[PDB]
Design a protein around this ligand. Structure first.
Ligand code: 2IR
Ligand code: CL
Length: 124
């Protein structure tokens, strides 16, 4: 199948709040992961056409990527830090679901996830 529309990133009728934790999720966690040498497959929606993955969105019904997470943070889409942390977990999970243990892409995700977990364990 083709790509779905990307996930929602802005909601004008939803209240906005800025939190120490959300600030840290954007300025520390997202920033650190984004700059990781293994991050580039995770910085934008999986392009099912360019990558020849016509079953990706048949298997993955809750797509997520760090580009989307970045926009959600920056637009104050998130009200609870757990929403953001869940999105990161969804992203890593999607990679594991689509692929198989031992696949090269899974090793990249695991490296990023380990760093993510360390930074989330220091959440203010
Ligand atoms: C790094 C890489 C290697 C090879 C290729 C070929 C197309 C040349 C491109 C490519 O670059 C790339 N860019 C973007 C995505 C993925 C990706 C993902 C993916 C899934 C979810 C997420 C999310 F959700 F966490 F963000 C992020 C990434 N899963 C697999 N792939 C590759 C595509 C083809 N596949 C090979 C087939 N396997 C099953 C043997 C490896 N790869
Ligand atoms: Cl970049």
């Amino acid at each position: 199948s083709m790509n779905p529309p990307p996930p929602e990133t802005s909601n004008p009728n939803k209240p906005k709040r800025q939190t120490n934790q959300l600030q840290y999720l954007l300025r520390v966690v997202l920033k650190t992961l984004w700059k990781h040498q293994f991050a580039w497959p995770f910085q934008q929606p999986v392009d099912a056409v360019k990558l020849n993955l016509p079953d990706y969105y048949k298997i993955i019904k809750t797509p997520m990527d760090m580009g989307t997470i970045k926009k959600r943070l920056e637009n104050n889409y998130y009200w609870n830090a757990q929403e953001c942390i869940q999105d990161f977990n969804t992203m890593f999970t999607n990679c594991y679901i689509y692929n198989k243990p031992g696949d090269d892409i899974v090793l990249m995700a695991e490296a990023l996830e380990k760093l993510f977990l360390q930074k989330i364990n220091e959440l203010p």
